[PDB]
Subunit: 597 residues, 3 copies
Amino acid sequence: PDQFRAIIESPEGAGHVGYQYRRNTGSTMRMVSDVLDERVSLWDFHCDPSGNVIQPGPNVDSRQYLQAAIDYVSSNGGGTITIPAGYTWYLGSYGVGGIAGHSGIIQLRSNVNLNIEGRIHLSPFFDLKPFQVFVGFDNGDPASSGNLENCHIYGHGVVDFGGYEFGASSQLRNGVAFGRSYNCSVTGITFQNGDVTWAITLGWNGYGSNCYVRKCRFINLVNSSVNADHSTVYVNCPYSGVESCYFSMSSSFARNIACSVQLHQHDTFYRGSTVNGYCRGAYVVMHAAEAAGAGSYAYNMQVENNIAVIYGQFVILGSDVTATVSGHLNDVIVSGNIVSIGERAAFSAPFGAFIDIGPDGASNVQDIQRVLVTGNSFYAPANITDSAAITLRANLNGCTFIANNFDCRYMVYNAPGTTSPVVQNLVWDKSNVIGGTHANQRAGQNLFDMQFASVVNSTIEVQLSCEDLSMFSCILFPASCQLSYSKITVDSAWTKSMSNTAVFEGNQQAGANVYVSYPATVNLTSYNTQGAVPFFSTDTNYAWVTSAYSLSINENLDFSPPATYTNKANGQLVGVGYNEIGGVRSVSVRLMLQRQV
Amino acid sequence: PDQFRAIIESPEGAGHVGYQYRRNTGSTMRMVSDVLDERVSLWDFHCDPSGNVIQPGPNVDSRQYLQAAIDYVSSNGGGTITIPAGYTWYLGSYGVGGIAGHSGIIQLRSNVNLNIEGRIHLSPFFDLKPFQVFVGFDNGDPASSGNLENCHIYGHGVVDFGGYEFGASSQLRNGVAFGRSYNCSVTGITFQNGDVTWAITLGWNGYGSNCYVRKCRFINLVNSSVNADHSTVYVNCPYSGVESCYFSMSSSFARNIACSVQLHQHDTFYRGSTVNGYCRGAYVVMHAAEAAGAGSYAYNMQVENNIAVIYGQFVILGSDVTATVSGHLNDVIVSGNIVSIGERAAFSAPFGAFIDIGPDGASNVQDIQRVLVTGNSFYAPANITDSAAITLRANLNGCTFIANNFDCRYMVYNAPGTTSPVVQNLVWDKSNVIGGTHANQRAGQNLFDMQFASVVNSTIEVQLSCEDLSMFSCILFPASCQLSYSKITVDSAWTKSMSNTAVFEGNQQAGANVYVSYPATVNLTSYNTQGAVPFFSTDTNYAWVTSAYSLSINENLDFSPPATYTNKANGQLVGVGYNEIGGVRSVSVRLMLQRQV
Amino acid sequence: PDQFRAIIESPEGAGHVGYQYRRNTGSTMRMVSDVLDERVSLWDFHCDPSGNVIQPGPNVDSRQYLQAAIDYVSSNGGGTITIPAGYTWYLGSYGVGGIAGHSGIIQLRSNVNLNIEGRIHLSPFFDLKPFQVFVGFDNGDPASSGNLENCHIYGHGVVDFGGYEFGASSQLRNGVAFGRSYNCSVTGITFQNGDVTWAITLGWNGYGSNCYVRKCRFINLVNSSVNADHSTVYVNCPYSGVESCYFSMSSSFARNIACSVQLHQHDTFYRGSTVNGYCRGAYVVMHAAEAAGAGSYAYNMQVENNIAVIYGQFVILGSDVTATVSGHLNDVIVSGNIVSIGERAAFSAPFGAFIDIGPDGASNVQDIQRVLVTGNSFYAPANITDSAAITLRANLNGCTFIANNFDCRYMVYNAPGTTSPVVQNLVWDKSNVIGGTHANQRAGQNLFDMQFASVVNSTIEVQLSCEDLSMFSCILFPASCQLSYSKITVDSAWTKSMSNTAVFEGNQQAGANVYVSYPATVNLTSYNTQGAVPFFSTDTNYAWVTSAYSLSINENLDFSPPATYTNKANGQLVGVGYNEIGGVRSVSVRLMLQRQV
Ligand SMILES: CC(=O)N[C@@H]1[C@@H](O[C@H]2O[C@H](CO)[C@H](O[C@H]3O[C@H](CO[C@@H]4O[C@@H](C)[C@H](O)[C@@H](O)[C@H]4O)[C@@H](O)[C@H](O)[C@H]3O)[C@H](O[C@@H]3O[C@H](CO)[C@@H](O)[C@H](O)[C@H]3NC(C)=O)[C@H]2O)[C@H](O)[C@@H](CO)O[C@@H]1O
Ligand SMILES: CC(=O)N[C@@H]1[C@@H](O[C@H]2O[C@H](CO)[C@H](O[C@H]3O[C@H](CO[C@@H]4O[C@@H](C)[C@H](O)[C@@H](O)[C@H]4O)[C@@H](O)[C@H](O)[C@H]3O)[C@H](O[C@@H]3O[C@H](CO)[C@@H](O)[C@H](O)[C@H]3NC(C)=O)[C@H]2O)[C@H](O)[C@@H](CO)O[C@@H]1O
Ligand SMILES: CC(=O)N[C@@H]1[C@@H](O[C@H]2O[C@H](CO)[C@H](O[C@H]3O[C@H](CO[C@@H]4O[C@@H](C)[C@H](O)[C@@H](O)[C@H]4O)[C@@H](O)[C@H](O)[C@H]3O)[C@H](O[C@@H]3O[C@H](CO)[C@@H](O)[C@H](O)[C@H]3NC(C)=O)[C@H]2O)[C@H](O)[C@@H](CO)O[C@@H]1O
Ligand code: NA
Ligand code: NA
Ligand code: NA
Ligand code: NA
Ligand code: NA
Ligand code: NA
C-alpha cells in the first residue's frame, strides 16, 4: 500500500498498471509496459549509467547508446529501432570489435532495422579521418565475416557527414556498408554534406543477395581535391539495385572524379534515377578480383530510364582478369535514358561519352559482349569537342546500338596514337539518329573515327539528318585498321556536297567479305558512237565496285550517261548510255558506289 | 498519498508511472508519458476548451484541431501526426493568415508529416466555393512566401472533396499545394469525388526541388460544366515527378477538359502510371511566366512507361514568351507508353493525338527541339477521323520519332487554313510502323498531310505494312509549303495500285537539296531499232529525277524495256532496253523514281 | 482508496491514469489506455480464455487469435494490426465459414491491414493438404461473394509455407487470395519454402480494381513432381499489376511448370522485376471464362523493364472462347526486358522463346492483335536448338517487332506437322538485330521457318550481322503456306556465300501483291555482237522478277555484263552490257533479285 506507490513510481510501475485493448472483454489482459515494449527507440538506451536520459547534441556522443540499442534488439530476434524526429544525434567516436578494421562507427545486426526520422550528424572528431558510419561486417577481415541479413534503414531522416574534408587520398569513407548482405535495403534517406568515397555499398565481392537502394537522396558528397575517387552506390552482390534515387554534386572536383553507381555483379539494375553534377553515371564492370561470391560473369545488367547531366561518361563497360580468374561482362541493356554533358569547355573534364569501353589501365583483357543500347537520348553542347556516342578505347567483343538519338561531336571515337582496340560485333543500326548540334564544328574530324587495330563482324549504317560540310568524312578507317566481314554504308541524304563520305586509307573496302556503299563524284568519258554507247571512268580506282548508280540529274538533251554501272578489271567503271547524236561525251556525276550490296 | 491518487488521475499521471524497456537494467528509466510522447495523433488536439475529446463527424469541423496539431509539432522541430483510421474527419471552415489568400483550409509546416490513415472529407460549407485543402505557402503572395521543406503526406487514407460542383468558372480548387516546396511528397493517398482544378501542385514558378507523387489514386475529380480546366498534378519545380499513380475520370466533361500531369520545369518525370477517362495525358511546357525559380529552360523531361485511354492528346509540347523572358523546351524523351483514344464519335472531343505541338494561342513563339519519341504504341478506333501520331499545329524546331507503332487516321497532320507552322528537324525514321486499323477510311485524305509554311532539315521515311487504296496520297505537300534540305521517301511495299504516292503540289521535290524517292506509273515509247534501243517517257515531268528503276514485270518475249533510267533536259526519262526484233514499243511501267538517293 | 489500487492493477487501470501530450496545456486530457488504443497487435488477441497471453511457437496454433483480431478491428471501421517482429506465429487449422470452401486459413476483411513484421509459418497439419493462407472472399461461391476493399499486407516479414509437398495434383495452394478485390496490395513481404499453385492472386474473373504487388520476394515455391502447375502472381482484375518484385526457384520441377505472372484483365502491368529458375515469365491472356467482371477484352497490357533467366517462354500471348463468350487480346506492349534461356540441354524443357503464341489446346480460336514488341534483349546459349524469338504456334491477328536484339537458334519458328497457324499482320522490322551465338549450329534449319497455313499483310526484313553458312536458308516458306500482300526481304550483307537465301517451295513470291528481294547466283550468256550486247539467264525461273542488279565484281577487261536486269515472258532475265571486242560471253554472277521493290 506504501509499497504500491513505490512500485508505481519505480521503473516496474508500468508493469503493474493493467490494460485491455479498447475494453474488449475478449482481448488479452496485459500491463501497460507490455504495450510499450512493442516499440523501441534511441530514447530507451540514450541514458547515463544511473538510467537518467541524456539530451543529444553537439557535445554528446550518441554512438554507444545506439550501439546498445542495436545489440539489445538483436538479442530478441530483431525489430525496428526509431531514431526520433525533431532531434539531431551526433556521432563522436569509433566503434570497436569487428568494425574497427573498417573504421566503423556503428555495427548493424541482422533483423534489426533502423527507422531514421531525425538527423544523424558526424562530430568534428571525424575531421580529416576515415570512417564508415554503419557497418554490417562483423570481422576486420571480410572473408571471415558472418552475414548481415534482413536489415533495413528507412524513414524521412538524414545522414549528414558534417562537411569535413578527407585528410589523405588513401583514406576511405562510407555511409552504409551492408557487408555480406542478404535482404538489406536503404529507403527514403538523405545522405548529404560530405567528402566520401561512397554513400552506400551493397554486398562484398559477390556475397550477398537482394540488396536495394530506393527513393534516397545523395547531395554534395564530394568537396575537396584530396578525395581520390567517389562512387555513390557500389553494388557488389547480385539480385540487387538502385531505383528512383536522386544524386546531386556541386563541387568542381565531383565533375572529374564522381560516379553515381557501380554495378559489379549479375542481375543488378540502376533505374528511374536523376543525376546532376557528376563526372560519370554508372560503371557496369566484372572485376575478376570481386568474383568470389557469385562467379566470374556479370550478366543481366540493366541501366534504364534515368535522367542525367554529367561531365564525363554516362555508362562505362569493362572487365578484367587476375592471375587465376578471368572476368566476363555480357547481357547488358542500356535503355530509355536521357543524358546530356553539362555546359563546360572542351577538354576541361574527362572525355564526354554516352558509352565508354572500359575501364582499366590495360585494354587487351576485356571480354564484353551482347550489350544492347537502345532508345536513349544523348546531347552535348556544340563547343564540346570531346563528346562521343561511344569512346571505344579497349577491346570489344560486341555492342549493339538501335534506335538511339545521339547529338554530339563524334558517333564512334577513339584517339589515334593511343590504344589499338580489337573490335568485334559492333552494330550501329540505321535507326540511330545523328543530330545536328555540332554541324559546322567538325573541320579536320571524322564523324565515325575508326581508330582501331581491327574491325570484324561489324555494321555501321550512317544516316545523316542534316548537312555538315565541315567534317572531313562521315567514316574513316586508317590503313592500320584491318576490316573484314563487315557492312559499312553511308546514306546519300545531305551528302551531295561532301568530298569524302567514307574513307578507307588502306583500301580495306576491297576485302572479299566487306559489304559497302557510299556516294562519290566520278568523271566519265564516252566513246563517240551514235546510239547505245559506253561511258567509262577516267580514274581506275573502282576494281572493288560491284555496281553504281546515278545520283545526279542529266542536264543534256543530246545524250544521257548510264543510269547504272559495273566495273572492269583495270579498275574503271563502265555503263551503257545513249547518244541521240554521236560525239565523245565528258561528264561529272555523283554516284552511289556499291560493293556486294 | 491522497496527493498520489490525484496526481495519477490527473493529466500528469502518466508522468509519474515508471517504465524501463523490457525490464532491461541497461535501458533508460523513463515515465510512461515519455514513451507516449514519441507519437502524436489528431486525438491529442481534437478537444474542447476544457480538454475533453470531441468525436469527429459531419457536424464537427476538425480544422482548428488539425491546425493546432501541425502548429505544435512544428514548434518541436517536426514529426509525423497520424490522422486515425476508422474515422472520417470533416473540414468545415477556411484557415487564416498566409493561406487565406490561397483559399487555404490547412497550413502545412516544415518537417511536419501527415500520416493519413482515416478519411478527410469536406463539409457542405464548401459547396460552390473555392478551396485548397493543404497549403504550404505562408503568405498570400507567393513571391513573399517562405519555403515548405521536408513535408510528407502518406498512408492508406482518403481525401474526399464531397462531390460539390464549382460555383463559378473563375474559382480554383486544389487538394495539396506544397508551395515553394523542397523535399515534399505525397504517397499512397486516394483523392476522390470532386470538381477541382488540381489535386496536387508541386513547387511555385520554379522554386522548389525533390517533390514527388507516388502510388496515389485520383478518382473522379471533375464533375461539372462549370469547371473551367483541370490538371491532376502540376509539377512546377525541378528534380520532381509523378511515378506509379492511377488516374480515373468518368464525367463527360473530363473528356474535354482534363489532363493528368503538367511537367513545367527541368528534370521532371511522369512514369509508370495508368490513366482512364481524361482528355489529355501530359503537357510538357516551359512557360516564360513560370521561369523565376529555375530559369527559362525545361530540359530533361521524361514521359515513360505509362498506360492511357484518353479522348484528346497524349503528350502536348510547348513553350512561350513574356515581354521580358523567353521560354525554351528541349531534351525530352517520350518512351514505352501504350495509349489509345477511347471509343467516341469523330470530332466529339479535342483532336486525338499521340503528340501535339503545343499549347497556346499563338504558334510563332515556340522553341521546342531535341525531343525523342521512341518505342511507344498508339491506337485509335477506325471511325476516329481526328486521330494523328502528331498534330503539328505550331512552330517546331525539332522532334525525332523512332521505332514507334502508330495505328490511327493520320501520321503527320495539321489543318489547312489554320496555322502555318515553320517546321525544322522533324525526323520520322523508317522504323515507325504504320498500322492498318484505318485502312479504307481515308478517302480524300493524305496520310502525312504536310500543311506547313515550310519544312527544312526534315526526314519522312514512309513505310506501309498493309494496303490502303482509299487514301489520296501517302504524303502531300501543298504549293504553299516550302521544302528544302530534306529527305522524303515512300517504300513501294503495298503501293503498287496507288495513283498517288507522294505529291508535291508546288513541285518542291525539285529543290537542289531535296532527296526523294517514290513509286509512279510512267508510259514509255521506244525507237524502232533492233538491238539495244532507247525508251523514253511520253510525259516531260521528270527533270528532277536522278534515276529510276522498274517495279513491273515484262510480259514480252520479243523485247524488254530498260531496267533503269536517267533523265534528259526536256524532262523525259530515258533508258536502254533491248529489241530482239525491231519495232516501236509502247509500255506502261511502275517505276521507283529517285532524286539524289 | 483500496478500490484505487485494485482499479489500477485491473485491466481498466490504464483507463484511470491521465495523460496530456508533452504537458501541452492545449492538448486533450486523455487516459493512457486511449493512446494505447491507437495501435493494435496480435498480442492483444493471442490469449487464453482467461485473458492470459500465450507465447507463439510450433505447438501453438495462432490462427483463431489472428482471426479474432481481424474480426474486431473490422467492427471499428478498420485499422492496421501488427504481427510482431522477433516471433514466429504458426498457423495450425482451417478457418470456417465462407473461406472453408476455398480451403482458407485466415479471412481478410475490408479496411483491415496487416503489418507483418515477424514470420508466419504453416504447421505440419497442412502437410499434403490444400490451403489458401489469406482469403478475401466471404462466400464459398465467389459469384455470391461480397468484395474485399482497402486491405493492404505489408512489412519486412515472411510467409513460410513449411516446405510441405502437395498431396495430389488436383489440390490448390495459395498465399493471398484477395478475392473480389478493390484497392488491395502486398508490399515488402517474402513468400518462401513451399509447393503451391500461387503465392498471390488478385481479383476474381474481372471483378476488382487497383490491386498491386510491389517489392515482394518469392523464393522456392515449387518443390515436387506432384505440383501440377504454378503461377506466382495471378492478376485477374483490371487496373492492377506487379512492380519491382523478385522471383526465384531452384527446383528442377519449376523449370518445367512455373510462371512468375499471369496478366488476365485490361490495364494490367508487370514491370521492373527479376526472375530466376522459372519455366515462364508471363502469360498475357484473355480467357472468355474469366470475362464476367471487366468484359471480354484484355487491352493495355504492359510487360516492361524486367530481367529474367527462364527455361521456357518469356511472354505467352493468348485468348479463347466459351460457348457464349469470345475473348480478345489487343494493345499489348513488351519493352525493355533483358531475358536469357538458362544453361540446359536442348529439348530438356519446354521450347525456349521470347514470345509464344498462345496458350491452349486449340489454335484456331485466338484473337490476338496490336501487339508491340520493342527494345528487348534475348539470348540463348548456342546448344539450345529449341530457342526462338517467336514460336508462332496458333492463329495470330498481329504482332509487331521493332528494334529488338535476338540471339538464339530461330527468329520465327513453328514445328512442321503440328499446327497450321493462320498469320496476319506479323511485322519484323529491319531494325531487329539477329545475333551470332548460334552461327554454325544451323545445319538443316531455316532461320525464319514459316510453317504456317497462310501469311498475309506481313513484313519480314531479314538483316544478318554475321555469317552463318550452316543454315539451309534465311527464310523458307513450304508449298502449303499461302503468302499474299506481304513484304519479304533479305539484305545481302554476310550472304554472298549462301546457296539459298529465301526459299519459296510453292513459288509464292510470284503472287501479284508479294513484294520481295533476295540474293541469288545466276548464270548468264551473251550474244556475240561487239558493242552494246544483251546477256540472258540460262535458266527460266525468273518470270516474277521486276529488276535485278549485280552484287559481283567484273574480273574482265574485254567486256562487262549488265549492271541491271529485267525479265522476259519466258522466265529469263535480260540486261544490256558491253562487248569491247565481240564474242559470246558466259558468266556467273551474284544478283539481288527484286520484285515490286
Ligand atoms: C570509388 C570507387 O568505387 N571507384 C571505382 C573503382 O573501385 C576500386 O577502387 C575503389 C577506390 O576507392 C575501391 O578500392 C578501395 O577500397 C578497397 C576495399 O576496401 C577494403 O575492403 C573493405 C571491405 C573494407 O571496409 C575497407 O576498410 C578496406 O579493407 C581497397 O582494398 C582498396 O585498397 C581501396 O583503394 C574499390 O574496392 C572495392 O570496394 C567495394 C565497395 O566497398 C568492395 O565491395 C569491394 O570489395 C572492393 N573491391 C576490391 C577488389 O577490393 C575498387 O574496386 C573501380 O575499380 C572502377 C571501375 O569500376 O570504378 C570506380 O573508379
Ligand atoms: C488547370 C491547369 O493547370 N491548366 C493548364 C494551364 O495552366 C494555366 O491555367 C491554369 C488554369 O487553372 C492556372 O491558372 C490559374 O491559376 C493561376 C495561379 O493561381 C494563383 O497563384 C497560386 C500560387 C495561388 O494559390 C492562387 O490562389 C492564385 O493566386 C492564376 O494566376 C490564374 O489566374 C488562374 O487562371 C495555371 O497557373 C499556374 O498554376 C500553378 C499550379 O497552381 C502554379 O504553380 C503556377 O504559378 C501558375 N502559373 C502562373 C503563370 O501563374 C496556368 O499556368 C497551362 O498553361 C496549359 C499549358 O500547360 O495546360 C493546362 O491547360
Ligand atoms: C497455375 C496457373 O495459374 N496456371 C495458369 C492457367 O490457369 C488455369 O489453371 C489453373 C491451374 O491451377 C487454375 O485452375 C484451377 O483453379 C481454378 C479456380 O479455383 C477455384 O475458384 C477459386 C476462386 C477458389 O478459391 C478455389 O477453391 C476453386 O474453387 C479451378 O476452377 C480449376 O478447376 C483449377 O484447375 C486457373 O483458374 C483461375 O484461378 C484464378 C486465380 O485463382 C482465379 O482468379 C480464376 O477465377 C480461375 N479461372 C477460372 C476459369 O476458374 C485456370 O485459369 C492458365 O489458363 C494458363 C494460360 O494463362 O496459364 C497458366 O497455366
Ligand atoms: Na579494412
Ligand atoms: Na591493325
Ligand atoms: Na491567391
Ligand atoms: Na510558305
Ligand atoms: Na473452392
Ligand atoms: Na495452307
